[PDB]
Amino acid sequence: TSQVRQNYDQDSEAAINRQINLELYASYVYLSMSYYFDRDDVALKNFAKYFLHQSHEERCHAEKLMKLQNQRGGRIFLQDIQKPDRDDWESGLNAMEAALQLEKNVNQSLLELHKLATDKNDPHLSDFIETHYLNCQVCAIKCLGDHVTNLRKMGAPESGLAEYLFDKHTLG
Template identity: 50%
Template structure:
């Protein structure tokens, strides 16, 4: 829709500010045009000693003001033609590259595989002949967190108009004992390597989004995952360092009790 206003007005002001007059034209049409404006200095206008701003008659300058035309129906013709009509196609999809869609599905698979390994660790440390309840609790929570990440990515995939395609999950180990390191240190080092792997995969996903100029996906990965991943790597690195100090002996039990009651004080 194009609006046209044909102004014809004069504004007079003297040094004392006593006189102000404004007269508007009585014609408004469907296009917008401005007439020329004239300034006069005090020397050329001795009567009021100030300045004079006046607009010439509309007939003297009828050129329309360009760059303000907005015709929504014309501008959405291209997008309207791209709206799918088949029920199998997403209606919400916009500027979402196939590479980004595939990378999201790969990341979902990574999160589920890591969750599966953590769940196996939970089952191991929960055995009656291992009985390290703190480590069992830690790995169970880690498994649930990774699964939550996978579900977040699934929701995001649907939000952008992609299709979630779940892939196969590899069978994890069921025994985590190590002759030299012991089971606690061995499992925690494995957890640290898994967290670094997830972080590396997230950075690869971010690069795919950057390559396809998908700013929204970049922001989503940064805000939802990367900061949390760096914090998890730092925390598990500290656990590995502590377990290396205490060895395989009685100190493992104390470490396990710390994990078991972690957060109890805050909850109380």
């Protein structure tokens, strides 16, 4: 037992480990999407660039969760990082739609983690999530929601013109 451990529940420790892997997967997903848009047959450079940043974000979000485990005397147990669902993501709209769902899945998971923190009576972990995850997940979700909304009304994905202009004007 860590000399620094205090009010940290075995279950929390395991959940944090669980989340650390979830965040890393969401990083792999975005990285994958990114390089999809880098293909000579796809060629949206700002979509590519956008998702590459989303990738850095989720990865950074995970390392912060690794620091948190260490801070509270827990122990990091890493798991295999599961390849994403698809290799070809079809279109800009179809990836933004996949991203939204992903973000809502990671968000769901974070909310679970919050209830657990509360049930175990753990304020430090509860505010840590509130402050550093839940708030920035609502943002991400509205961002993607908006993009999906613009791309649709623009005639996507049946209109490579829509995706092209979007790429330029909104993701530029």
